């Protein structure tokens, strides 16, 4: 009867070299540069990303003066793209912009549908498996540029799969049935050589040990040869699983980077984030959903729903008035509450927008009720 | 009314920015497809103010012009004149494509995927998503048949549906709002488009037992929209609409401009297979099946299923049930369901499930 009560759940991550973060990471610098001389800028800057080329398409109303190449260079260097061996160089790609660019009772700036989510499985009241996936891209990324790995290289992609059990509602982790690992080389390491710095010096140093056992499966370079990665194109906007929950909870379908608070894809998922972990955090339920939806007319929301998993001893209806008391979810107020006016968006764009204590959506309100 | 809940799912229409670009994109693997069956593809494509451009890449005999091929769908969409923001007669195209000359194959990526079935609707649909992709399908079918001349392509519809639950199966009471935007010519008035929306496009589509007068109506809400089409529009950035409007989960995978090589789209498409099949087939209400790959690597990782409650059998015995039944290895769903046939354009607007013309939309019969 024990594996009649166990399920596996998958959640995946990829890294800062990914194609499509790369656009994310680059979007969000566009973003953050406008912010940081116009906090009022408004943005929309999507990224394509293919063999030796970055294009800038969108809007933008602001008074700043953005330089651009500068802009999306640094990027592309701080990532660690630096030489053609590697597939891609910020000193030698093409950069063509086109951006049209123009210089608390707001009615939302388009229609949608929004999604929060938190889990007691974990102190950040994340998933595991997104959880894990994200921290051993963020471990590959370290061990590269400290010297660590010197043949790593910025393109990765990560995998985990975890064996779950259903507690009343609430999900609790039993252990990592199976770990992926694709990652960038150079074309000196061999094969053996990674595999073992892999599971030794990656997993093991981000995965703690009591979710690993002698029959979890390991997947390591599983194509084998990985030597050119980087930029088919990426585009802004195609890891939003991995951006927020690895498949948990639910996902209203809109992507964050490049896109400034006055975008509710952006700015209401925080919100609703920050919601769902302050009523975790606040003892009033294990696990919940928070579904919030606009019309492009209206400034307050069009509904409010609620989803507990039966992990709270108050009803939904009841989780909702204390939500109502505590939140004010229009669009202008959102931003006051999680200053989103600061330039602080492409930080986010790799490893997860949710899950780390740094952003002001993960610093639990104080609910009163 | 404590076991009662709102929910809320999102469509577009044809003209949207984001369904232009993925319209464009499996038009062009349509393309290839109908002269070459083994031709790979990843075409992305990029929309904004005249300007479409494709971007990826193709391994394909076939000898297929991009100029026509976009241009025909822009066409089809119905963007025709600068009037209406767009024209496919003056549009810019730049192609940036680089096109290059068994069972048990690797998947040619890693990834997770979900199909999703619930006995809410005879499509096994949610409500929520049907209506609303519905909704902009009759907006489109007036416009072409001339009922409604003012129409033009680029629209967005919301449909809120009121929802009870029986241990897991969902059980639609009502709708509860209705948001629909469209964009229109110069000439008609905000009064005649609002009561056209209602009395040719709402009734004409929502069953009358799930509408009464507390039904909230948001029409053209935003006021005036006569230009619309191409915020530049990008291939892959509505995969939710594409799919169940917020219901089950969503692996990340975008579906259009990707040939059946790649699980993002094959698998899920596999996925969906299962879920209808088991709903279809009396075992379940309501199913998740999650399904995930390692590059190179052909059995799948991981099959996972959820039930709901919605079962007096066991997930464990369900998935016991689709081993028996299904091979989810790449190489086989693809001969499964026919997936070299030039059939993808289809999918790129009102959502790749809930339609019976599909091959992932007819049900297996299942053996246990
Ligand atoms: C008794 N039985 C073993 C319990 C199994 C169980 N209990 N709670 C959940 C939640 C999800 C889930 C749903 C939606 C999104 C993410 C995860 C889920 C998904 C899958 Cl594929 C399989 C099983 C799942 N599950
Ligand atoms: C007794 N109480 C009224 C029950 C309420 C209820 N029962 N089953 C579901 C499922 C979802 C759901 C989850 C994930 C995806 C889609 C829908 C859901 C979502 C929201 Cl926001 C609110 C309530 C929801 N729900």
Redesign the interface.
Same mark, same amino acid.
């Given at each position: 009867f024990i594996? /009649?009560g166990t399920?596996?759940?998958? *959640? /995946?991550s990829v890294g800062e070299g990914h194609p499509d973060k790369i656009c994310d990471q680059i979007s969000d610098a566009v973003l953050d540069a406008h912010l940081q001389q116009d906090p009022d800028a408004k943005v929309?800057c =999507?990224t394509?990303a293919? %063999?030796g080329?970055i294009?800038l398409?969108? =809007?933008i109303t602001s008074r700043a003066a953005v330089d651009y190449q500068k802009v999306v260079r640094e990027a592309v260097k701080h990532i660690g793209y630096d030489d053609s061996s590697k597939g891609f160089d910020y000193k030698t790609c093409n950069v063509l912009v #086109?951006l =049209?660019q123009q210089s608390e009772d707001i009615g939302a700036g388009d +229609?949608?549908?929004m999604?929060g989510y938190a889990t007691d499985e974990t102190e950040e009241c994340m998933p595991l498996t997104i959880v894990l996936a994200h921290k051993l891209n963020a471990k590959l990324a370290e061990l590269r540029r400290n010297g660590t790995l010197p043949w790593l290289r910025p393109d990765s992609?990560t +995998?985990v %799969?975890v064996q779950y059990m259903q507690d009343r509602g609430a999900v609790l982790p039993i252990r990592v $049935? %199976?770990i992926?690992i *694709?990652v960038q080389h150079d074309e000196e390491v061999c094969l053996d050589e990674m595999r073992d710095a892999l599971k030794e010096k990656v997993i093991k140093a981000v995965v703690p040990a009591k979710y690993l056992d002698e029959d979890t499966?390991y $997947?390591l370079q599983? *194509?084998?040869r990985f030597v050119i990665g980087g930029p088919?194109?990426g585009? %802004? !906007? @195609?890891? &939003? &699983?991995?951006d927020t929950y690895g498949?948990?909870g #639910? $996902?209203? !379908?809109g #992507?964050f980077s490049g896109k400034d608070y006055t975008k509710v894809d952006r700015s209401a998922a925080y919100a609703a984030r920050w919601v769902a972990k302050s009523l975790v955090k606040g003892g009033l339920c294990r696990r919940v959903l928070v +579904?919030v939806?606009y019309?492009?007319?209206?400034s307050h929301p069009?509904?409010i729903?609620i989803?507990h998993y039966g992990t709270s001893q108050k009803? =939904? @209806?009841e989780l909702l008035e204390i939500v109502k008391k505590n939140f004010d979810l229009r669009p202008g107020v959102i931003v006051r509450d999680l200053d989103l006016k600061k330039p602080i968006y492409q930080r986010t764009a790799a490893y997860g927008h949710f899950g780390r204590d740094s952003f002001p959506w993960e610093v639990p309100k104080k609910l009163k009720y």
């Amino acid at each position: 009867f024990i594996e /009649e009560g166990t399920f596996l759940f998958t *959640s /995946e991550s990829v890294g800062e070299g990914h194609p499509d973060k790369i656009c994310d990471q680059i979007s969000d610098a566009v973003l953050d540069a406008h912010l940081q001389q116009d906090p009022d800028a408004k943005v929309a800057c =999507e990224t394509v990303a293919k %063999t030796g080329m970055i294009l800038l398409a969108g =809007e933008i109303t602001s008074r700043a003066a953005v330089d651009y190449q500068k802009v999306v260079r640094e990027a592309v260097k701080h990532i660690g793209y630096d030489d053609s061996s590697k597939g891609f160089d910020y000193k030698t790609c093409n950069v063509l912009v #086109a951006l =049209e660019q123009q210089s608390e009772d707001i009615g939302a700036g388009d +229609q949608g549908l929004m999604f929060g989510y938190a889990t007691d499985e974990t102190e950040e009241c994340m998933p595991l498996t997104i959880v894990l996936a994200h921290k051993l891209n963020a471990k590959l990324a370290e061990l590269r540029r400290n010297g660590t790995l010197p043949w790593l290289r910025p393109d990765s992609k990560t +995998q985990v %799969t975890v064996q779950y059990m259903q507690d009343r509602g609430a999900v609790l982790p039993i252990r990592v $049935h %199976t770990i992926v690992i *694709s990652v960038q080389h150079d074309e000196e390491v061999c094969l053996d050589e990674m595999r073992d710095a892999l599971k030794e010096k990656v997993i093991k140093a981000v995965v703690p040990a009591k979710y690993l056992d002698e029959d979890t499966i390991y $997947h390591l370079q599983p *194509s084998g040869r990985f030597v050119i990665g980087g930029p088919d194109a990426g585009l %802004t !906007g @195609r890891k &939003i &699983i991995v951006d927020t929950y690895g498949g948990w909870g #639910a $996902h209203g !379908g809109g #992507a964050f980077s490049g896109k400034d608070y006055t975008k509710v894809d952006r700015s209401a998922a925080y919100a609703a984030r920050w919601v769902a972990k302050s009523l975790v955090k606040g003892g009033l339920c294990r696990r919940v959903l928070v +579904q919030v939806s606009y019309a492009i007319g209206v400034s307050h929301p069009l509904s409010i729903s609620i989803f507990h998993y039966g992990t709270s001893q108050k009803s =939904e @209806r009841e989780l909702l008035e204390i939500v109502k008391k505590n939140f004010d979810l229009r669009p202008g107020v959102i931003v006051r509450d999680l200053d989103l006016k600061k330039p602080i968006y492409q930080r986010t764009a790799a490893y997860g927008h949710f899950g780390r204590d740094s952003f002001p959506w993960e610093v639990p309100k104080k609910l009163k009720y």
